[model samples]
Target: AVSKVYARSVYDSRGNPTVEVELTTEKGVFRSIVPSGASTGVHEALEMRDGDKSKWMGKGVLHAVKNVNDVIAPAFVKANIDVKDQKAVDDFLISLDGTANKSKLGANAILGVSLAASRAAAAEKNVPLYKHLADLSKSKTSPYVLPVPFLNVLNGGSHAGGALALQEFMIAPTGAKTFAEALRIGSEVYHNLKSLTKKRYGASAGNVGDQGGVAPNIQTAEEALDLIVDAIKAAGHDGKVKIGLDCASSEFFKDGKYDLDFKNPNSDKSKWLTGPQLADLYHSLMKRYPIVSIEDPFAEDDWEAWSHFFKTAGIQIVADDLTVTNPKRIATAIEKKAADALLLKVNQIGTLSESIKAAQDSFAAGWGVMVSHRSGETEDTFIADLVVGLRTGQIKTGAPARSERLAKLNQLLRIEEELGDNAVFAGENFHHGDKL
Candidate 1:
C-alpha cells in the first residue's frame, strides 16, 4: 500500500525553486527531487509554475506541491505496488493531468511522485537501484557496463555569459580502461585547461559558468577546440581524450540561418551562415579536431538540413532538441535518417517510462544513447544510476568542478567500486561504433 504522499518546494543549483516528493509505503519512505532545465526545447514536457508575480518572480511551483498532497495523494494510497509497471504508474499521472504537455497538474508534480514511487518499490525488492531500473527497462547489456563520461570543460552560448558561439566544448576520454581511470584522466585535463586559460586570458578566464565549465572569452569555435587539444596534450592524454561539442545551434538559428560569431554573441555584428555553409563549417572542424560527437548541430525544425549533415559527416550526430526524448519525434528522426544518437533527459519526457522507451527505440535503431543532465540541475545524481541501469554507455553531466556536477561523477565512482571486476567502461565502441 502507498500509505501516504507529500511534497515540498526546494531550490536547485540555479537557485530556482523546484518540487520534491515523498512516498510512504509498506516498505519504507522514499523521496525524489525533480530537476529543471535552462536551454529547454519547445516540445519538451512542461514544468508547471505559478504566474504569481509576488512569489519567486513567477517561477514558484507551490501549486504543483498542492496537487501532490491534495489530489494525487488520495489516488495512490492503497494501490498495488507494481515496481516494474512504470508505464502504468506514469500513465495514471498523465491521465490525471489530462493535458497533452502535462500543463494542468504540472510535469514537475507528476515526475516527483513517479520517481519517489519507483525508489520505494526498489527498496521493497531489496536490490540496488540500478538493478531495479535495469529490470524495469528490460535492458539488454550487462548491468555493469559503465558509461563514458563527456566532460564539459568549456562553456559558451546560453550556458555562459562569455562571447562564444558553441554552448558546450566537452572532452570524452574514450581510451580509458575503466570509469575510474577515465575520470582521473578527465580531471587532469580539466585542471590543465584551467591553468592554460588563466595564464592566457587572465584570472577571470578560469571562472565557471552554469555547468561549472571554464567560461573563457574565446573569439571562435576553432580557438576553443585548439585550447581543448592543448589541454589534453599538456595532460599527456591527447590520443585518449577526443572532443565533443554541444553546438546548441537552435539558440542562434533565426530566419532560416545560423549566427556564429564568438566575438559578438548578442546578435550584434555576428557571422551568419546558411544551412549548407554551416554543414561545410562542421566538416572543416572535423578535419582539424578529433571530434567524436556533436549535439543539436542544426535547428530542430530543419529536418532536411540535419539529414544532409549526418550523411556528410563521419562522426556521431546527436539529436537533443530535435527529439526532446519524445518517442514520436525519435521515430520520425529515425525514419528520416536525421541523427545517429539521442540525448536522454528524464525531465524532457516528464516520466522515466517514456525516457526508457525512447532509449530502447534509439538502441533498436542502431543509434547511440546518452543520458544527460540539465544545465540548471540539482545534486541528485539520479542520471548516474540511470546511465548505468540502461547501459547507455554515454553521459554528459558537466565538468568535475561544482558540487552538483561532482555529485554524479562521485556516485558513478562508488557504483564502479561496488561492481569491481564486473564493471566495464563503454570506451570508444559505445559511440555508434565510430572510429574515434
Candidate 2:
C-alpha cells in the first residue's frame, strides 16, 4: 500500500535547480533525483523551467516542485495503485497530466515521481533495483551483463567553450575483460589526456568541463581526435581502447551549413561546409583513427544526410538528437535506416516504461542501445542499474573524473561484485549484448 509522497527542489552537477521526489511504501522510502541536459534535442519532452531570469538564472524548478507537491502527491496517494505495477502507475501519472510532451505537469516533475515508483517497487519486492528493473523490462536476469564504459574525456561544442564544434570525444574500452577493468583502462587514458592537454594547450586547459573533461584549446576536430589517440597510446591501450563521438551537430548546424568553428562570433562564413562535405570530413577522420561510433553526426531534422550516410557508416551510428528516445522518432529513424544504434536517455522520454520500451523496440530492430547520462547530473546512480538491468551493453556517463559521473560507475562496480561469477562484461559483444 502506498503511504506518502513528497517532492523538493534540488541542485544538479551544474548548480541548476532540479526535482527530487520521495515515495514511501510499506517497506521504506525511495528517492529519485532528476538530471538536466545542455545540448538537448528540440523534439524531446519539455523540462519546464521558471522563466524569471533572476531566480537561478531562469532555470528554477519551483513551479515543477509545486506541481508534484500539490497535484501529483495527493492524486497518487489517493489512487492506492500498487507501486510494483510500474506501467499502470506511469499510465495513471501520464493521464493525470493529460498532455503530450508532459508539459502540463512538467516532464521533470513526472519523471521525478516516476523514478521514485521504480525504486520503491524494488524495495517492496526485496530485490536489488536492477533485478526489479530487469523483470519490468522483461530482460533475462541471468548472464547479467555490464556495459562498456564510453568515457567522454574531451569536452567540446556546447559542453565547452573551445573552437572545436564537436560536442564530445570519448574513449570506449570495449576490449577489457570486465567492467572494473574497463574503468581502469578509461581512467588511465583520462589521466594521460589531462597531462597531455596541459602540456599542449597551456595549464588552464586543465580546467575541467561540466563532465570533468579537459577542454583543450584545439581549433580543429582532427586536433581533438589526435589528443584522444595520443592519450590512448600513452596509456598503453592502443588497440583495446577505441574512440566514440557525440557530434551534437544540431548545435552548429545553421542555414543548411555545418559550422566547424561555431564558437567564434566573427568566424569565416566561407569555411562552413555542406552536409556531404562534413560527412567526408568524418570519413577521413575515422579512416585514420580507431573510431568505432559517431552520434548525432548531423542535425536532428537532417534525415536526408542521415539516411545516405548510414548506408556505409560501417561503425556504430548512434542517434541522440535524431531520435530523442521518442518512439515515433525511433520508428521514423528505423524506417529511414538513419542509424544503427539508439542513445537511451531516461529523461528524454520522461518515463521509465517508455525509456525501456524504446530500448526494447531498438533491440527488436537489431540496433545497439547505449544508455546515456546528461551533462548536468546528480549523485543519483539510477542509470547504472538501468544499463545493467536492460543489458544495453554500452553506457556514456562522462569521464571517470566527476563524482556525479563516477557515482554510477562505482555503483556498477558494487553490482559486479555482488553478482560475482554471474556478471558478464560486455566487451567485444557490446553492440550485441541483447542477443547474449
Candidate 3:
C-alpha cells in the first residue's frame, strides 16, 4: 500500500521545470522524474505550465507540482489502492483526472504518480522493476530482452542551432552479439563520427546538440548520411551497425509542401518538394546508405502521404509524431496502414498503463515498438527497464554520450549483467522482438 505521495518541481535536460513525484510505501520512498518533449505533437496530453512569463520564461511547472500535492496526494491516501496493483493504481489516477487527455490535473503530474507506484510495487514484491513490469504486462515476453540501441549521433533542425531540415541521424548497432558489445560499437563509432565532423566542419561542429547528438552545421540530409557512413567505415563496423533517421519532417512542413530548405525563409514554393518528391529523395538515400529505419518521414496528420510511403518505402517506418504514443492515434495509424512501428514515449501518453497498452496494441497489430526518450530528459532510467520488460526490441535515447542519455544505457548494462544468460539481445530482429 502507498502511504504517502508527494511532488516537487525539478529541472530537465533543457533546463525547464518538470514534475517529480515521490511515492512512499512500507519498503521506502519511490521517486519518478518526468521528462518533457521539445517537438510535442498537437494532440499530446496537456502538460500543465504556470503560463507565467515572469517565471522561467513561462516554463514553470509549479502549478503541476501543486496539483499533485494538493489534489492527487490527498486522494491517493484516501483511496488506499495497493501500490503493487499497477492497473488499479493507474486507473485511479486516470479517473481522478476525468479528462480524455489528462488536462484536469496535468498529464505530467498524473504520469509522475503512475510511474512512481510501479517502483514502489517492485520494492514491495522484492523484484527488479523490469521483472515486476514483466509480470504486470505478461504479454509476448520471456526472460526479458536486451534492446537494439539506435544512437542518435547527429542532430539537425530544431534540436540543433543550424539549418539541416532532417532532425536526427542515428546509428543502430543491430549486428552486435550482446547489449554490452553493442554499446562498445556505438561508442567507438560515435568517437569516429566526432573526429570526422571536426575535420570536415571545424572543431565547433564537434559540439553536442540537445539530445547529445553532434550538431554539425551542415545542410541537406545527404551530407549527414555521408558523414555517418564514413564514420562507420572508420570504426570498422560497416556490417555490424546500421543507420536510422528521424526526419521529424513535421518541423519543415508548410501548407502542403515539404520544405527541404526550411531555414531559407525566403525560399520559393518551386524549391519546396511535394510528398512524392520527398519520398523519392528518401528512397534515393535508402539506396545509398544502409538505413534500416526511418521515423516520422511525413508530417503529422499527413495520413495520405504516410500510407503512400508505407505501400512502397520498404524500410522500417517508425511513427513518432504520427501516433504520438496515444492509443486513439495508434489505432488510426494502424487502420490507415501508415506506419510499421510505434515509438513509445511515456510522456506522450501521460501514464504507464496507457503507454503499455499502446505498445501491446501495436504488437497485437503486428507492428514493432521502439521505446524512446524525450529530447529533454531526466536522470531517470524508467524507460530502460520499460524496454527490457516489454521486450520492445529497440530504443533511441540519444547518442552514447551525455550523462542524461548514458544514465539509461548504463542502467541497461546493469540489467543485462543481472539477467546473466537468461536474456536475448535484439539484433537484426529489432523490428519484431515480440515474435522473437
**Model 2 lDDT per residue over 351-386, tens place:** 999998899999999999999999999999999999
Q: Return whichever of 1 and 2 wins on lDDT.
A: 2
Better of 1 and 3 by lDDT: 3
- What digit string (tens of lDDT, one per residue) describes model 3 on residues 1-436? 7789999988898898999999998899999999999888788899899989999999999989999999999999999999888889989988999999999999999999999999999998899999888888885455567999999999887657777888889999999999999999999999999999999889988889988889988878888899998999999998899999998899888989998878777867788999999989989999999999999999889999999989988889999988989999999999999998999999998888889899989999999999999999989999999999899889999898887899999999999999988889989999998777
Instruction: Show the colliding residue pairs in model 1.
Output: none
C-alpha lDDT score of every prediction, in listed order:
0.86, 0.92, 0.91
Best by lDDT: 2
Q: Give the alpha carbon lDDT tens digit for every residue of 108-174 in model 1.
A: 8898888887787778888778877888888654436888899999999865766788899999999
- Which segments of model 3 are wrong by more than 4 Å? none
Error of 3 at 97 (Å): 1.0
